[PDB]
């Protein structure tokens, strides 16, 4: 029955701002209501046709496919796969290819083999990403929309099919190996198709090896990754042969998935162009090559350093998951060979060498001491897995998780202190495990503070007190911890020399930046909140709120911060000249400490690339240059993530 | 030209707000979102009107979150293109902030696109602090920044 006439008239006599919900629906379930009129709200709005209805229609080609059409289809499938790997939805990006809906109906061996290879690669990538679970809410969409992805044929059979397809094309390539332009074009197209098939097989084999439970197969993928370089060179050289799109290419239906789109607001992913396809795959191959070397490290600290260095590259979602899975193939076994407790014991012995873990002490064979140290290690096994998982996330979401991990690390520090005190009482070796936990806590705090610079969360007027906490308090504590660790190693007897040198350089640069910012404020070149009311005390307390959970080192409140960082303590108070001179001296010290370091790696070169230009600026500005100007200076963070270049 | 700031009074002003927000904001808002924000907290919504038209609109919310601190929220801000750079938006946010602090608010939060440098400069001048980075938080694709103003 129709009641529109009786409904519109009734609704037109309302109170102009009155709703009709009865008793349990107010404005909140009414939020997120899909207004089915707007283009940006309603997800659903020639002829839409799926593969089954396209085979009979004839608009699709399922037999005797021309080489340029094959090249175009393969290239666009690669583009869709890369777009999915970049974080877009599966259904709207990769399954627009009508061939991978059901490869059984495909009769051409090359197209069917490539479709099965793409499906297997997608399945392996989804399994690895889900197992690691290092992806956030919007960095990956692993939902398959109820589709089936090559669950029938085994992966080894798919690789064999790809190999057979490549072998059936090698004969064609060699048959035309040689002045007829048409045969030259045919040979070039055949070579391009072979290159694409071979690269697909290489990538699938690399992922398969990463899916194996034996760590031996991981190292075997390096040769295939090397072959991928030449394969991609060929694939990029032969790119103007395939059939171009008409956006909509002959074979793809962009809107074939309309009943499977989520009911929420649409994001409308945009598939990338064919030009950038080759570059992304080369970068991914290089990233996987970097990942494959993680099975050689034997100690926990090197593993953590490698994880930090890899995450500093801002890698893709798939590669991080691969690294996480190859680090922890099981819930408790690292690399599938060593239990993590043994790894933590080895790390402790190499870093501080407590008497309990030393074979030459009477505490190794004791029953109570062994149980106590085993309990401590078992309690410590979890926070390190959590820390590595946090390192596996993206750059934006690392800060919050790092701030949250401090509670568990402080509990672990307290437990370590109690254990060490009890063991020392039993022995009669002081603060050994405490020193180790303090070093890890200080490293976490340092990285947490620097991630603020990395993500542009710190304002211009907030630099001067952020660098002070890094320089005078945190890195000063870190140097004491490393010196205590190095001292205890020799006292019970340099692996920590490089870390000590790097820490010294970082501390010197941070102190120089702090002095420069303080002098800039004193001159009047830094813009401050001109209005309203936001006390710097509240800003400081909320900036350093996560540090309140930890107890050692004690948190520094605003009242204590002013006393320590006050320039009035020096009699007479220093003018801006003096602060500029001090900053120049700090930069010179950092440059010398780096230049004296043998074999400078990539991390040293970038830091040298900011210390040198900033030192010249500090000396030039120390002479009174542009002293009367009140314009704010420009800080460029391109050279280094955490340390900007002071440009006037 | 005399610019007058008038608080929200009745639903007859809703079409003025909807026109200003839609033509300026990028994310899509249904009419029920405006109805929720206006009806639940009418004391925090202010408009900038000249003559017999509307040139500004600020829509805000205030509600306790996690039973830990009463957090204020600036949900919508818009100034007409022909009238920007006259300090209309700054005064709108000032009045919203004063209303929130009269309502015993502990903090004020908001999001904005990182590419929108004008709003970032305005909030930094006013005293807001960048708190979190959100990747692809919007529909357009621009990474969003969560600005906070800690009062206590």
């Amino acid at each position: 029955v129709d009641i529109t006439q009786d409904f519109e008239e009734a609704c037109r006599e309302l109170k102009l701002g009155e709703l009709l919900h009865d008793k349990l629906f107010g404005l909140f379930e009414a939020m997120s209501a899909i207004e089915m009129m707007d283009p940006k709200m309603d997800a659903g709005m020639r002829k839409v046709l799926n593969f089954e209805q396209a085979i009979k229609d004839g608009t699709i080609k399922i037999k005797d496919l021309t080489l340029p059409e094959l090249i175009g289809i393969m290239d666009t499938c690669f583009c869709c796969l890369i777009t999915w790997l970049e974080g877009h939805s599966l259904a709207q990006t990769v399954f627009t290819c009508l061939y991978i809906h059901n490869p059984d109906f495909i009769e051409d061996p090359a197209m069917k083999a490539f479709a099965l290879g793409i499906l297997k690669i997608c399945d392996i990538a989804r399994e690895k990403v889900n197992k690691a679970a290092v992806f956030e809410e919007e960095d990956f969409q692993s939902m398959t929309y109820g589709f089936k992805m090559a669950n029938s044929v085994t992966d080894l059979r798919v690789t064999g099919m790809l190999k057979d397809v490549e072998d059936d094309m090698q004969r064609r390539v060699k048959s035309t190996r040689s002045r007829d332009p048409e045969v030259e074009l045919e040979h070039q197209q055949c070579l391009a198709v072979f290159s694409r098939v071979k690269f697909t097989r290489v990538l699938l084999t690399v992922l398969i090896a990463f899916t194996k439970k034996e760590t031996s197969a991981v190292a075997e993928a390096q040769k295939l990754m090397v072959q991928a370089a030449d394969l991609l060179s060929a694939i990029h050289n032969s790119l103007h042969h395939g059939i171009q799109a008409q956006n909509i290419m002959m074979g793809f239906e962009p809107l074939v998935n309309q009943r499977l789109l989520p009911p929420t607001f649409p994001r409308y992913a945009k598939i990338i162009k064919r030009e950038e396809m080759v570059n992304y795959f080369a970068r991914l191959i290089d990233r996987i090559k970097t990942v494959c070397e993680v099975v050689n490290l034997t100690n926990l600290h090197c593993i953590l350093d490698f994880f930090c260095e890899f995450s500093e590259q801002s890698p893709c979602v798939l590669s991080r998951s691969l690294l996480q899975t190859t680090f922890l193939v099981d819930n408790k076994k690292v690399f599938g060979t060593h239990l993590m407790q043994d790894m933590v014991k080895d790390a402790l012995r190499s870093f501080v060498s407590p008497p309990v873990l030393s074979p030459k002490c009477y505490l190794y064979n004791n029953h109570q001491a062994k149980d106590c140290i085993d309990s401590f290690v078992t309690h410590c096994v979890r926070p390190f897995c959590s820390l590595i998982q946090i390192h596996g996330h993206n750059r934006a979401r690392q800060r919050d998780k790092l701030g949250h991990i401090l509670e568990e690390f402080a509990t672990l520090q307290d437990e370590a202190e109690k254990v060490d005190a009890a063991l020392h009482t039993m022995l009669l070796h002081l603060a050994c495990l405490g020193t180790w936990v303090l070093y890890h806590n200080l490293r976490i705090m340092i990285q947490y503070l620097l991630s603020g610079f990395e993500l542009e969360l710190y304002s211009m007027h907030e630099y001067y007190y952020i660098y002070w906490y890094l320089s005078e308090f945190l890195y000063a504590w870190l140097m004491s911890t490393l010196s205590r660790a190095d001292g205890s190693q020799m006292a019970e007897e340099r692996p920590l020399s490089r870390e000590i040198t790097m820490s010294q350089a970082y501390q010197n640069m941070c102190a120089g930046m702090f002095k420069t910012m303080v002098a800039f404020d004193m001159d009047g070149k830094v813009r401050k909140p001109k209005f309203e009311l936001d006390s710097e005390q509240v800003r400081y307390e909320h900036r350093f709120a996560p540090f309140n959970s930890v107890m050692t080192p004690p948190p520094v409140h605003y009242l204590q911060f002013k006393e320590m960082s006050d320039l009035n303590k020096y009699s007479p108070p220093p003018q801006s000249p003096e602060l500029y001179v001090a900053a120049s001296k700090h930069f010179q010290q950092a440059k010398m400490i780096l230049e004296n370091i043998p074999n400078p790696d990539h991390e040293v070169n970038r830091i040298l690339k900011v210390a040198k230009p900033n030192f010249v600026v500090m000396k030039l500005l120390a002479g009174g240059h542009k002293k009367e100007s009140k314009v704010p200076p420009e800080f460029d963070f391109s050279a280094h993530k955490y340390f900007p270049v002071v440009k006037l | 030209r005399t610019i007058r700031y008038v608080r929200y009074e009745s639903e007859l002003q809703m079409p003025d707000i909807m026109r200003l927000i839609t033509k300026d904001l990028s994310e899509p808002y249904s009419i029920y979102t405006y109805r929720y924000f206006i009806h639940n907290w009418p004391q925090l919504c202010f408009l900038a009107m000249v003559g017999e038209e509307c040139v500004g609109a600020i829509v805000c919310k205030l509600d306790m979150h996690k039973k830990m601190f009463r957090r204020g929220y600036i949900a919508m801000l818009a100034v007409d293109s022909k009238y920007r750079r006259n300090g209309i938006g700054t005064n709108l946010v000032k009045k919203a902030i004063y209303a929130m602090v009269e309502g015993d608010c502990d903090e004020v939060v908001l999001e904005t696109e990182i590419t929108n440098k004008s709003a970032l400069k305005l909030y930094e001048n006013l005293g807001f602090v960048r708190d979190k980075r959100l990747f692809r938080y919007y529909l357009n694709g621009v990474d969003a920044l969560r600005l906070k103003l800690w009062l206590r």
Binding site: - | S26, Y29, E111, Y138
Partner: peptide
């Protein structure tokens, strides 16, 4: 700009 209220975001989801």
């Amino acid at each position: 700009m209220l975001g989801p």
